[PDB]
Symmetry: C3
């Protein structure tokens, strides 16, 4: 059994009306997130971490910012699709860990539901999906409420 590591990172800016979608979960907030998809940084970062582990590039590589094939869709579809590909190459999920970086809104109440979504989307047990949040103690663009960042790592098995 060969094992593979992956990393992902994403940022999206605030704009317009709430809510925001993070980890599939619709979360109420004063601002919404500017996006060409649904702006779900958590799932984008996770997808990159997963793809990178399977050495398949990134989301922008699999789903061009323009292309007809998979266009203007919600990030859960993109996640499921990438996982389809990652499995086609003969990988199963080791586990994933996600780190949301945001000053607000409060993510912790929504994390259990995010895990239901991700566990479903990758067809695994919840105990292989972990999600956290942190603030930057009001420092930097996230700390000064301009956007949200997210990091994810992934482990795969062949």
């Amino acid at each position: 059994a060969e094992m593979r590591i992956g990393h992902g990172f994403d940022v999206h800016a605030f704009g317009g009306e709430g809510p925001i979608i993070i980890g599939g979960v619709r979360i109420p907030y004063e601002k919404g997130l500017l996006a060409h998809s649904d702006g779900d940084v958590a799932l984008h970062a996770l997808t990159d971490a997963l793809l990178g582990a399977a050495a398949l590039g990134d989301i922008g590589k699999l789903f061009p910012d323009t292309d007809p094939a998979f266009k203007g869709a919600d990030s859960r579809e993109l996640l499921r699709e990438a996982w389809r590909r990652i499995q086609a190459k003969g990988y199963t999920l080791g586990n994933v860990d996600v780190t949301i970086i945001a000053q607000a809104p409060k993510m912790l109440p929504h994390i259990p539901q995010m895990r239901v979504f991700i566990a479903e989307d990758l067809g695994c047990h919840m105990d292989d999906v972990n999600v956290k949040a942190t603030t930057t103690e009001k420092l930097g663009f996230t700390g000064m409420g301009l956007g949200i960042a997210c990091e994810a790592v992934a482990l795969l098995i062949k």
Copy 2:
């Protein structure tokens, strides 16, 4: 033997008198770090990386920002406590890698002592604990001396 990956990230802002505690080590600096605990970003980030690998959430989940149980303590206690929990679920340490992001102070002289602390706190050999530092070449909130960031990754074995 099943293997598990984890990631952690933390930021704290400068304020008041030095010194700062980073990786358990008390380091002299003009400013100190604003915190509800001892503001040890290195250990916080490590703890999250470890917890995330064991799919146990984050420090804020285990030790609420308010709660009586483990209150206003130093981050080495929180680290040891989380490791107690991570072991209770039947995990041993693969290895940890930590990345301090700070313009100053200079971290490199203190890294050997940080590793003594962490290796003790997780009850392992030093050769399973790695710590680095980097500046952001004067860019961003860390680069403009407003705070310190840290990243950690962890590998666990069941």
Copy 3:
């Protein structure tokens, strides 16, 4: 077979004439990168991820900012040298995943060539090297075109 995780992170600021070197690849851009070496954030971050996995510190530890031994060289040499050391301790490459964080230039056309370089430098198959890019949607120092950040993770086998 024991397995080891590593993480790396690097930033460099824009300045002077293009081009920039990223992942060994010379990429045309209006500004160049301020550096004591060639300012290759991608390879620096990768090297730290690799060294950290082998618990050998960071690049600044192996190659002091001043030292005669390996001085003012290009980052591919530093990468190859660190890999020599990492192998001397009895490690082979599991895989690496790299994440470039930059508003511009566009990295995606250059990624295939970056992988040729890294795969050569670590003497492995391309399918063990993954590289991505992302913008911070115009937010933060990278988003406001002041510099480039990069993250890397690495897996090693003993």
